[PDB]
Chains A and B, each alone.
Chain A
Amino acid sequence: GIVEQCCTSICSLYQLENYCN
């Protein structure tokens, strides 16, 4: 999930945008 991809590891804009509506 988002925590594993951005919190436990370094995030990226590509991944963040996957969570926008």
Chain B
Amino acid sequence: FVNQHLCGSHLVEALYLVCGERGFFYTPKA
């Protein structure tokens, strides 16, 4: 589910699943 175009809520969900308890940061305007 990681190797594709991930945008918006779809990208946020991938980060949630991959990072787990470590958490993550989402910066659209980077």
B2 touches A12 (CB 8 A): yes
Interface size on B, residues (CB 8 A): 22
A-B contacts, 8 of them at CB < 8 A, read A2-B30, A6-B11, A7-B11, A8-B5, A16-B2, A19-B24, A19-B25, A20-B18
Residues A1-21 near B (CB distance < 8 A): 1-3, 6-13, 16-17, 19-21
What does DSSP make chain B's interface, helix, strand, loop or mixed?
loop
B7 touches A21 (CB 8 A): no
What residues of chain A lie closer than 8 Å to B24, measured between beta carbons?
A: 19-21
Q: How far is the CB of A5 from chain B (nearest CB, A)?
A: 10
Given A9-B5, A10-B5: A3 and B28 interface contact (C-beta under 8 Å): yes
